[PDB]
Design an enzyme around this catalytic site. Sequence first.
Site: not given
Ligand SMILES: CCCCCCCCCCCCCC(=O)SCCNC(=O)CCNC(=O)[C@H](O)C(C)(C)COP(=O)(O)OP(=O)(O)OC[C@H]1O[C@@H](n2cnc3c(N)ncnc32)[C@H](O)[C@@H]1OP(=O)(O)O
Ligand SMILES: Cc1nn(C)c(C)c1Cc1nnc(-c2cc(Cl)ccc2OC2CCNCC2)o1
Length: 411
Positions: A411, A4, A159
């Site tokens: 946030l 992707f 996300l």
């Molecule tokens: C002009 C406006 C533009 C707006 C858009 C700007 C871009 C915004 C981008 C988003 C910024 C978000 C900021 C936040 O919210 S960061 C917080 C992300 N959320 C979580 O960590 C919560 C727990 N995890 C999940 O919900 C899932 O594991 C997620 C949803 C993260 C991936 O779902 P899943 O695990 O089911 O995988 P898939 O098979 O569907 O997809 C696989 C593809 O996803 C790529 N992937 C994995 N993690 C991330 C990630 N954190 N940012 C971007 N991409 C990520 C990965 O490299 C792979 O691509 P490729 O490596 O194959 O190429």
């Molecule tokens: C879930 C969880 N709960 N706790 C208590 C921890 C340390 C985690 C793991 C973790 N993941 N991100 C952080 C984080 C940890 C710190 Cl120290 C400061 C900011 C963090 O992320 C914030 C909130 C979401 N967006 C980005 C800024 O901490």
Amino acid sequence: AHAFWSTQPVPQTEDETEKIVFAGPMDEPKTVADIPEEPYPIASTFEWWTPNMEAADDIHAIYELLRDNYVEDDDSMFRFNYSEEFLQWALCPPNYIPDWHVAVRRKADKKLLAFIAGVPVTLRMGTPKYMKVKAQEKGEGEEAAKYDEPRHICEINFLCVHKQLREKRLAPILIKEATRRVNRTNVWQAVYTAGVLLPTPYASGQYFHRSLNPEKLVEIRFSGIPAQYQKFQNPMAMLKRNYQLPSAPKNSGLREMKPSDVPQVRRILMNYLDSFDVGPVFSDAEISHYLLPRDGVVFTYVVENDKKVTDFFSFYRIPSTVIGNSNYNLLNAAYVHYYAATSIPLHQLILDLLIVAHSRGFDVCNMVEILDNRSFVEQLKFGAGDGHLRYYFYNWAYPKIKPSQVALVML
Ligand SMILES: CCCCCCCCCCCCCC(=O)SCCNC(=O)CCNC(=O)[C@H](O)C(C)(C)COP(=O)(O)OP(=O)(O)OC[C@H]1O[C@@H](n2cnc3c(N)ncnc32)[C@H](O)[C@@H]1OP(=O)(O)O
Ligand SMILES: Cc1nn(C)c(C)c1Cc1nnc(-c2cc(Cl)ccc2OC2CCNCC2)o1
Ligand SMILES: [Mg+2]
């Protein structure tokens, strides 16, 4: 390797990021009229959904998806539990665009399966001071200053794909559809963070923690009793004594922020932020929204001397679920938000943050090493955590910068 992120307008490698010298765009200049008017195709068992952030049910649906499926620590001990009131505050700032909140639901039962949120931010994101002075001496100041003006862009957060749907390439489809909705509003850049490595960050900063209730932190295994604390006869008494804090703030002018403070906080904050290379620009209405106290969500104190606000600090609350602990359900964390000090050293102002946080029943104070957050790490007894928050742009070339040159709190 990235099926992707290969297809998207971002740097593709470190040392393309190391190469870049001027800020500016990546994709082909495009127009609104070029962008498809119809939502991106999705499989017929799913449907796109634009939640109504004014509807308690819709906020509840997003709250349950994130409570059960959002970010965990690396050892799957903790998961964020953002509250419904927090999500209302985060997703509905002044002039937000309802279409930028994108969800996927199962058509049959309307079960929320995936979500992504975008909101407006005004961001300074022109060339860093360090690349600008290089440029001056080399004859190129005009091209360096080309994108100096704050830009109205999208900030992406929240996300989430449901755990039952992971690794089915649903996150790309969400990011495509969010990009289409944003681009239809004539916006072409986004800013986002992640705690994972993706192509390619322009800055990275270590997490830091400050223990406020070490008894509880050790009980839920956020913290251990460090080996050093063993050849004392008594572990926990010594740990409490180490992290103990005064009961009341030590700055006498400290009080909660009130609406009439909005202009002066706006001024002292804009003056402080404008020093960093990448940082937000806030209107009065955005200062009101993001800094006025809101119960259980955001907490903001000013120092007022002789009727003039000279300093302030803010922190926001995110509780984490403690995954399978009997004694404790929740970890109550305060995260350092924006601040500005003009009358007292930054350490003295942030001590008062820790004191208020502890009095209000928080267990830990967390932050990333952005802004001047390094200047009070040792005296205030913060420790580096085990991870980094990575900063990224969508469609924006940007030099690698240090995290001490970033002023956008996420946030
Ligand atoms: C002009 C406006 C533009 C707006 C858009 C700007 C871009 C915004 C981008 C988003 C910024 C978000 C900021 C936040 O919210 S960061 C917080 C992300 N959320 C979580 O960590 C919560 C727990 N995890 C999940 O919900 C899932 O594991 C997620 C949803 C993260 C991936 O779902 P899943 O695990 O089911 O995988 P898939 O098979 O569907 O997809 C696989 C593809 O996803 C790529 N992937 C994995 N993690 C991330 C990630 N954190 N940012 C971007 N991409 C990520 C990965 O490299 C792979 O691509 P490729 O490596 O194959 O190429
Ligand atoms: C879930 C969880 N709960 N706790 C208590 C921890 C340390 C985690 C793991 C973790 N993941 N991100 C952080 C984080 C940890 C710190 Cl120290 C400061 C900011 C963090 O992320 C914030 C909130 C979401 N967006 C980005 C800024 O901490
Ligand atoms: Mg998937």
